[PDB]
């Protein structure tokens, strides 16, 4: 016989108090990109950017992240 | 015989108090992109950007994320 | 017989008090990128950027992260 | 017979009090990148940047991180 | 008494033989311009551009110029 | 008495033989310009560009120039 | 009495034989310019660029120049 008991408890807390965020300026002068890739062959769970000129301004009032992977494997 | 008990408890908290967000400016001068890719062949769960000139201004009042993958596998 | 009891407790705390964020300026003069890659062949859980000219301004009021991987494997 | 009891307790605390953040300026003059890679072959859990000219301005009011990997393996 | 004789002779020649002109490509990625000029005051024979984002493709089969200012001033 | 004789002779020649001009490519990634000029005051024969992001592709089959200023001043 | 005789002779020659011009590529990654000039005051025969991000591709089949200033001044 086998018994497995997986009873994790999480009363955890992730938080911020953040006042004014204010004067965020993001002013990029524009570059230049070239790519040559005579053939491509992607096959499983692939994430790809091949050519890109990508600006982001990401200004979250909180932006608090909490990743909580569980895995229970029996064989 | 086998018994498995998977009883995780989560009373967890993810939070922000964020005041004014205010003057976010995102003013990108526009680049230039070229790609040559004489053939492509994508086959399973592929995410792809091949050529791109992509600006984002992402300004969430909260933006708090909480990812909670469970997996229980028996064989 | 076997008994396994996996009962972790987490009352943990991740936090910030952050006042004004204020004058963040991000003003990049635009570069130049070239790539030649006569063939590519990606096959499992691949993350790829092949050519890129990517600016980010990431200004989270909190931005507190908490990664909590569990794994219980029985054989 | 076997008994395993995995009962870690974590009442831990990760924190900051951070006043004004203020005048962060990030003004990069734009470089130049070239890559030649006549063929590529990626196969498992690969993270790759092949050519890149990437600026980041990451200004989190908190930015406190807490990584908590557990693993319990029985054979 | 005074005599002035202004008898310049010009049998001059300005010329080109120019075959095919062919594949001129002019593909500009679009910039960004800002100007602040709280007051302006222009007064004689002024040529001005104050803000501009101006592309030209000027492809004259000849384009030969010949400027020939004379001036004779007596007092 | 006075005599002045101004009899310049010009049988001069300016020339080119130029075959094919061919593959001229002009592909500028787009910059970024800012100007602050709280007041301006221009007054005689002024040529001015105050802010500008200006591309030119000037491909004359000849483009031969010949400037020939004369001036005769008597007092 | 006075006699002045100004009889310059110019049978001069300016020339080129130039075959194919061919593969001229001009691919600038885009910069960034800022100017602050709290007041300006221009007054005679002024040529000015105050802020600029200016690309030129000037590909003349000939481009031969010939400047020939004369001046005769009597007092």
Curated annotation (Swiss-Prot), chains A, B, C, D, E, F, G:
Site (Not glycated): 7, 13, 17, 27, 36, 39, 66, 71
Post-translational modification: Phosphorylation at serine and threonine residues in S-P or T-P motifs by proline-directed protein kinases (PDPK1, CDK1, CDK5, GSK3, MAPK) (only 2-3 sites per protein in interphase, seven-fold increase in mitosis, and in the form associated with paired helical filaments (PHF-tau)), and at serine residues in K-X-G-S motifs by MAP/microtubule affinity-regulating kinase (MARK1, MARK2, MARK3 or MARK4), causing detachment from microtubules, and their disassembly. Phosphorylation decreases with age. Polyubiquitinated. Requires functional TRAF6 and may provoke SQSTM1-dependent degradation by the proteasome. PHF-tau can be modified by three different forms of polyubiquitination. 'Lys-48'-linked polyubiquitination is the major form, 'Lys-6'-linked and 'Lys-11'-linked polyubiquitination also occur.
Its biological purpose: Promotes microtubule assembly and stability, and might be involved in the establishment and maintenance of neuronal polarity. The C-terminus binds axonal microtubules while the N-terminus binds neural plasma membrane components, suggesting that tau functions as a linker protein between both. Axonal polarity is predetermined by TAU/MAPT localization (in the neuronal cell) in the domain of the cell body defined by the centrosome. The short isoforms allow plasticity of the cytoskeleton whereas the longer isoforms may preferentially play a role in its stabilization.
Residue location of crosslink Glycyl lysine isopeptide (Lys-Gly) (interchain with G-Cter in ubiquitin): 7, 13, 17, 27, 39, 43, 49, 65, 71
Subcellular localization(s) per the UniProt record: Cytoplasm, Cytosol; Cell membrane; Cytoplasm, Cytoskeleton; Cell projection, Axon
Full-protein residues shown: 622 to 696 of 758
Disease: In Alzheimer disease, the neuronal cytoskeleton in the brain is progressively disrupted and replaced by tangles of paired helical filaments (PHF) and straight filaments, mainly composed of hyperphosphorylated forms of TAU (PHF-TAU or AD P-TAU). O-GlcNAcylation is greatly reduced in Alzheimer disease brain cerebral cortex leading to an increase in TAU/MAPT phosphorylations.
Residues bearing PTM N6,N6-dimethyllysine: 7
Annotated protein name in UniProt: Microtubule-associated protein tau
Residues annotated with Phosphoserine modification: 1, 20, 48, 52
Sugar-bearing residue positions: 43, 49, 65
Domain notes: The tau/MAP repeat binds to tubulin. Type I isoforms contain 3 repeats while type II isoforms contain 4 repeats.
Residues with PTM N6-acetyllysine: 7, 13, 17, 27, 39, 43, 65
Protein encoded by which gene: MAPT
TM helices/strands, residue ranges: none
Ranges occupied by Tau/MAP repeats: 2-32, 33-64
Phenotype upon changing residue 48 to L: In fatal respiratory hypoventilation; unusual apparent autosomal recessive inheritance; reduced binding to microtubules as well as increased fibrillization and aggregation
Signal peptide: none
Residue(s) carrying Omega-N-methylarginine: 45
Lineage, highest ranks first: Eukaryota, Metazoa, Chordata, Craniata, Vertebrata
């Amino acid at each position: 016989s086998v018994q497995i008991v997986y009873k994790p408890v999480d009363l955890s807390k992730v938080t911020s108090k953040c006042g004014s965020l204010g004067n965020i300026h993001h002013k990029p002068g524009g570059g230049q990109v070239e790519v040559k890739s005579e053939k491509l062959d992607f096959k499983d769970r692939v994430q790809s950017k091949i050519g890109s000129l990508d600006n982001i301004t990401h200004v979250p009032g909180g932006g608090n992240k909490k990743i909580e992977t569980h895995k229970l494997t029996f064989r």
